[model samples]
Target: GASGSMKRKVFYSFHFDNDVMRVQQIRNMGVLEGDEPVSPNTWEQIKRTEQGVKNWINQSLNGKSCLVVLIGSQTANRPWVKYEIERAWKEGKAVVGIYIHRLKCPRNGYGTKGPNPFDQFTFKRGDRVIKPLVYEPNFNDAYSDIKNNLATWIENAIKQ
Candidate 1:
């Protein structure tokens, strides 16, 4: 592991209302920042003001090397999710998308798959422009595979 003993600090982006439970499944994987899923009320408060949300997101992205978007039903349609992706890109952070629609919600079971939010934007690397990479983990075994490989996923995205 090029990262050696360091755990990657990730800023996760997702459609809050629709995908929280599924995202939480990934967050429980015990990597750095896994234990700190933002609370619903906190998210609401952040969204209550435009500047506040942007400030909070920037603060969250500060010092974070990667941004992982948890793609669920309607995730691509979300404004904040798009903003987060754009902001992460502008800040020169590595960005990746993980399809989470297969992960069951505690209350709602599995979700319908959505389009990759990363596809909506192109990023510049050197003089070339490209879309960020998105990963679709094996749906039949989403939790374990994501838990085991998230660090490697972040590392690979950073390398891009």
Candidate 2:
């Protein structure tokens, strides 16, 4: 699954309130840093103050090699999600987007497919402006299949 000898510590950025069910499914995959995902209650508390949230984001991002944007229906328009992506870029971490709309959420069933959040940002690669890599899994078995391949996906993102 992973290329390295150890698991990668990935900081996941996404729409919390809107996509918690889908995001929680991804978190339960037992890949990446499975035990450390920020809880909804904790996130709500942290989000009450901008500085608190920024500090938490900075802290969570420490020692992480990649940022995985779990793209859901409203992920692109979210201010904090964008901030997390930009911050990850600025911090020199590898960033990638994986569309999670097709995954069946326990509470919501399935979501409407959404735009790639990466398109909202442009990064300069030499003289060219480029968007980071984004992946869309086959929806026929999206939940199980995407969970199966997350490690390799994270590895590929770090390579880019």
Candidate 3:
């Protein structure tokens, strides 16, 4: 196997309520194994305790070398996704983002595109700021574009 196309495990940082289906679609993109399925109610309950959310994220991120921020319309403003992104960086995990808003929803249809999730935050260490690239596939064929580019994008991120 090529160094750049190896299969990997990754934790997906996303706004569940808005983009779960789009996130679901990417699971078969074939190079990244993502978070396990969780019921909507379960997440609502987990949010009640701040520590619980962190705990879940830690466990999900374990053994994973990369963090994929699946940005939906409201993902940029979601607090826990923010924490997940920051924590991934702190742990030296390769961080990447994908604009999943254009990915067709399983239950609904295409969604309102969100601003790049990276635009909302800046991590400053010394004199520089760090931000990860968020890939926006061709909206007309979002699924196929992602399937072809996802692995490359991830490997590129890890190379950083």
Candidate 4:
């Protein structure tokens, strides 16, 4: 089942605010462009109802081998996002947290004018064991880390 059509899939987890600004950039990815993989940003209006939202999230996560969480300052406080990450972990999926920091002048702990999400997740296995796939301030600034690391993490997770 891990092979053929059931090859490992990677789900992207992120804050809603960031989704508005950053998701298009992600959508442009050569790898994800035509995949039709469900993205929360893509289903916003349709997911307004509780059942719709739950169904959407479940579908996005179903059969995924890994979850890549884009972490920003506000990320820590987002309950829904936190729930997604925990769910991925509990399901034995490989979870990767990539911290997106502002690359420019305005720097608080939150970083630039953009959505600065943060992470406050403590896995059931504990913090020491949960090493994120990668950590960076803002990949959009240089874009190299996002490009390189995203591929690397996905490949590694799939291989596992």
TM-scores for every candidate against the unseen true structure: 0.89, 0.87, 0.87, 0.64
Collision count for each candidate, in order: 0, 0, 0, 15
Residue-wise lDDT of candidate 3 within 113-145, one digit each (tens)? 888877777865455787787798897989999
How many angstroms is residue 11 displaced in model 4 relative to the true structure, after the best TM-score fit? 1.8
Scanning candidate 4 in windows of ten residues, the lowest lDDT window is 103-112
Q: Identify the superior model by lDDT, candidate 3 or candidate 4.
A: 3
Question: Which candidate comes out best when scored by TM-score?
Answer: 1
**Model-by-model lDDT, in order?**
0.82, 0.82, 0.83, 0.56
Q: What is the C-alpha local distance difference test score of candidate 2? A: 0.82
Q: What is the lDDT of residue 53 in candidate 3?
A: 80
The CA root-mean-square deviation of candidate 3, after full C-alpha superposition on the true structure, stands at 2.9
lDDT of 1 at 118: 71
Q: Please estimate how well model 1 matches the true structure, expressed as its whole-model Cα lDDT.
A: 0.82
Task: List, residue by residue over 33-149, the lDDT tens digit for candidate 1.
Answer: 632656878878887999998899888888888899889889899998888888888888898888998888998898898987877666797788877878888879888878888
Give the C-alpha miss distance for residue 75 in model 1, angstroms. Answer: 1.0
RMSD to the hidden true structure, all candidates? 3.1, 3.1, 2.9, 6.3
Model 2 misplaced regions, further than 4 Å: 1-5, 125-128
Model 3 ranges off by over 4 Å: 1-6, 41-45, 124-127
